[PDB]
């Protein structure tokens, strides 16, 4: 209840941590630990009736975010773990079910079968990109194919539970919490050309409500970097 | 020199051997290891996780997220079937493309038990009851709620808990996992009555596979 980091404070009341391991620290990489370790609340998305899903590429949603974004232009390298708090707040008269899954190395697929998607289309900075429940056509050149039953990666979307995940059932549950360690092949990588995590929120059972209730429900994502450090002097 | 004598099957290439081989690049000083999280030592750890079962195919929901949702509504006749699916393997069943059933298509003989978890994603104010019938191999599919009750079953009160587990065995009539309305869905005013159920499947941790082959999911 009412946890705080730096100059921010959020409140909480069930956590699922990564692949079982907890994030920790390692020329010489220096340790900045107090200046940017805080809760970065992104803006809320609206869960409507015929909504399809959302995604965020994770070391890119915190690129225009304050002093964390200032520490990226000053540093060529870095390695960072995360802690993600997702909560949506509806009444007891709404009903639905969300899957909050955190995918490492999620290559997206382009709509044209020869090309590859562009950086403006793969990831909106600190802004959610949307799945669709129709097909993106082949005629446009560089756009992400977002048929949500394939999850944009050419796979069964029901089998996405092999990644570290959490269900949000409005009947019983209210929030989700993930703690994701640093997963990469190299120990310290180029932070400008690599988005090594992807946070997806997909409504399996759609939102429903009776006439009179509030016709859409907000979802609030909060990311807090754990064990961030960069390389330089 | 030392007298040797070469036997049959000497200068042959058997593709399934294990022999020492001369290294093309010695003196390279290979890159050391690194602790990356999430190591897989066996394929049965991939099968032990829960995955959503597309139990609502119906030829127009397969290109949707509606394939995973079982429709539940408050009708007027007491005693009806919600869903039902056989446990016959391979012949286009519903546990086929799931994350368990993708490993068991790489082998020819496998035999064990299955967890089946159901989750009621309806309102918090809706109540009701369900029967969860399992017919063993040899016994027919039940055609009433009554003779479904006379077999093995679980009565699932939705208002108490929102998740019910049912464990069956699955070996390479072979079974049925039908489910029935015991009572209707009682709902207050200003609450919707059309609710859905999701179904998860897993491996019940204790089984084995033999004789690896290649998957039928390719051109």
């Amino acid at each position, epitope marked *: 209840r009412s946890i705080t980091l730096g100059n921010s404070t959020i409140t909480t009341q069930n956590v699922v941590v990564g692949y079982g391991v907890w994030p920790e620290y390692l020329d010489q990489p220096t340790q900045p630990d107090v200046a940017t370790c805080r809760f970065y609340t992104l803006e809320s998305v609206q869960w*409507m*009736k*015929n*909504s*399809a899903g959302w995604w965020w590429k994770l070391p890119d949603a915190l690129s225009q975010m304050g002093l964390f974004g200032q520490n990226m232009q000053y540093h060529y390298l870095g390695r960072t773990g995360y802690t993600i708090h997702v909560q949506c707040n509806a009444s007891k008269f709404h009903q639905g079910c969300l899957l909050v899954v955190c995918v490492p190395e999620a290559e997206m697929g382009c709509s044209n079968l020869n090309n590859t998607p562009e950086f403006s289309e793969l990831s909106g900075g600190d802004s959610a990109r*949307m799945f*669709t*429940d*129709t*097909q*993106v*056509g*082949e*005629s*446009n050149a560089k756009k992400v194919q977002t048929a949500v039953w394939n999850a944009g990666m050419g796979v069964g979307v029901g089998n996405l539970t092999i990644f570290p995940h959490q269900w949000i059932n409005l009947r019983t549950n209210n929030s989700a919490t993930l703690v994701m360690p640093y997963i990469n092949s190299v120990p310290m990588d180029n932070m400008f050309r690599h988005n090594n995590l992807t946070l997806m929120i997909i409504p399996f059972v*759609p939102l429903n409500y009776s006439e009179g209730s509030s016709p859409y429900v907000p979802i609030t994502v909060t990311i807090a970097p754990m064990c961030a450090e960069y390389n330089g002097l | 020199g030392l007298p040797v004598m070469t036997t049959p099957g000497s200068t042959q290439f058997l593709t399934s051997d294990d022999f020492q081989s001369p290294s093309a690049m010695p003196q390279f000083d290979v890159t050391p290891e690194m602790q990356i999280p999430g190591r897989v030592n066996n394929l049965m750890e991939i099968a032990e996780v829960d995955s959503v079962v597309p139990v609502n195919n119906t*030829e*127009d*929901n397969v*290109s*949707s997220l*509606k394939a995973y*949702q079982i429709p539940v509504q408050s009708n007027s006749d007491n005693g009806k079937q919600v869903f039902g699916f056989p446990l016959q393997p391979g012949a286009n069943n519903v546990l086929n493309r799931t994350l368990l059933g993708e490993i068991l298509n790489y082998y020819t003989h496998w035999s064990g038990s299955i967890k089946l978890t159901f989750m009621f994603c309806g309102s918090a104010m809706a109540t009701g009851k369900f029967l969860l019938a399992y017919s063993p191999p040899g016994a027919g599919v039940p055609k009433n709620r009554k003779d479904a009750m006379l077999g093995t079953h679980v009565i699932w009160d939705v208002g108490l808990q929102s998740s019910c587990v049912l464990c069956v065995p699955w070996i390479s009539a072979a079974g049925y996992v039908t489910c029935w309305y015991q009572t209707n869905i009682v709902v207050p005013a200003d609450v919707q009555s059309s609710c859905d159920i999701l179904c998860f499947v897993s491996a019940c941790n204790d089984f084995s596979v033999r004789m690896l082959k290649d998957t039928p999911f390719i051109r």
Partner: antibody, heavy 124, light 107 residues
Framework: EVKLVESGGGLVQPGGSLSLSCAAS????????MNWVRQPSGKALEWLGF??????????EYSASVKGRFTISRDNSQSILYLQMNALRAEDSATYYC????????????????WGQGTSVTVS | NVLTQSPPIMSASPGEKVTMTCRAS???????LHWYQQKSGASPKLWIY???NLASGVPARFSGSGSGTSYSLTISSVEAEDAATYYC?????????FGAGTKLELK
């Protein structure tokens, strides 16, 4: 009741521009897909494009024949659907309809349930 | 993916059964094939959606069928007020292609 009227057609020199407009009343505008279909004099129909609802982000999907020339949009104030036609040719002389789609299960079948009365566009 | 309708011109007296077919070039799914009806000097109307389901306000004389790459539409009893043109729509990829048109004139 559902009522889709539209307006804006007329005469145009080939190589010019024209803007059609579809006025929608009788339903919530931000919840359905809205299409654009043309038909020449006594020929088959031809689908030009649609525009998805608010929950899918108002993205557009043009046909391969008119991609780059035409533009579908909407007005954020009132329930008016637009069609900016640019670089008109000799074979664009047709009757332009305005259609709507809905979800039948929870799925999106690609049908067009309600149609507009049709404005006529011809070139000279 | 183009659709061919046959016959183009169809004539039949009222009271009998007549049918038309719409054969696709490739495989189209059963849920993405629809039938429309356009009278002379009027906009089209959705008639049958997803190859078997009657729309709203349509009389029960019609029933669509077919699967794979061959689809059809049957009229059990022909009246006088349902003489129009009938088109079939599909979706395999983009774009949404229509039929050629089947004109029904009463005899």
């Amino acid at each position: 009741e559902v009522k889709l009227v539209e307006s804006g057609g007329g005469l145009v020199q080939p190589g010019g521009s024209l803007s059609l407009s579809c006025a929608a009343s009788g339903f919530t505008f931000t919840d359905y897909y809205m299409n654009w279909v043309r038909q020449p004099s006594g020929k088959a129909l031809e689908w030009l494009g649609f525009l998805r609802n608010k929950a899918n982000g108002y993205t557009t999907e043009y046909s391969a024949s008119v991609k780059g020339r035409f533009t579908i949009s909407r007005d954020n104030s009132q329930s008016i659907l637009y069609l900016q036609m640019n670089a008109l040719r000799a074979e664009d002389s047709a009757t332009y309809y305005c259609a709507r789609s809905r979800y039948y299960g929870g799925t999106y079948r690609y049908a067009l349930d309600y149609w507009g009365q049709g404005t006529s566009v011809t070139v000279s | 993916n183009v659709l061919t309708q046959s016959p183009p011109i169809m004539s039949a007296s009222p009271g009998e059964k007549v049918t038309m077919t719409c054969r696709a070039s490739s495989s189209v799914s059963s849920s993405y094939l629809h039938w429309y009806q356009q009278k002379s000097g009027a906009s089209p109307k959705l008639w049958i959606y997803s190859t078997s389901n009657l729309a709203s306000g349509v009389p029960a004389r019609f029933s669509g069928s077919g699967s794979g790459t061959s689809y059809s539409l049957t009229i059990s009893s022909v009246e006088a007020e349902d003489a129009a043109t009938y088109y079939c729509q599909q979706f395999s990829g983009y774009p949404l292609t229509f039929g050629a048109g089947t004109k029904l004139e009463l005899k």
